[PDB]
């Protein structure tokens, strides 16, 4: 399975699954600062799933590693803002992160394999 391009639709389908998860709702849109006016003192680089889907559809990711870095930022940014490791939203982020890591592993493996095969000779 050496298709160098296959990651892109694979990542589109996984983002569709994440948007279907109730656990995604808080992380779907860029954080609103009216409810959280201190956010940009705590979080240097805001990220959300709509930004990730738009970046993908724009043709502005070169690899599934770059998309994975952005998605992991959504979860590190969630971990950075939680006052309690027993926060509802933080707990939502931990479950969605486990779901995401479970599904992205084959995408990364298949892509890195395809690129090694491309440079075999
Ligand atoms: C994505 C996210 N992930 C999490 C995780 C936890 C919370 C959360 O429950 N809190 C309480 C309220 N906070 C506040 O800013 N208040 C202070 C007292 C610090 C001033 C801190 C975050 C909010 C979010 C969002 C931004 C939606």
Curated annotation (Swiss-Prot):
Disulfide bonds: none annotated. It comes from the Eukaryota. It is found in: Nucleus. Residues 2-107 form the Bromo domain. The modification Phosphothreonine is found at residue 45. It is linked to Chung-Jansen syndrome: An autosomal dominant disorder characterized by developmental delay, intellectual disability, autistic features, anxiety, hypotonia, obesity, and dysmorphic features. This is PH-interacting protein. It comes from Homo sapiens (Human). The chain holds residues 1315 to 1435 of 1821 of the full protein.
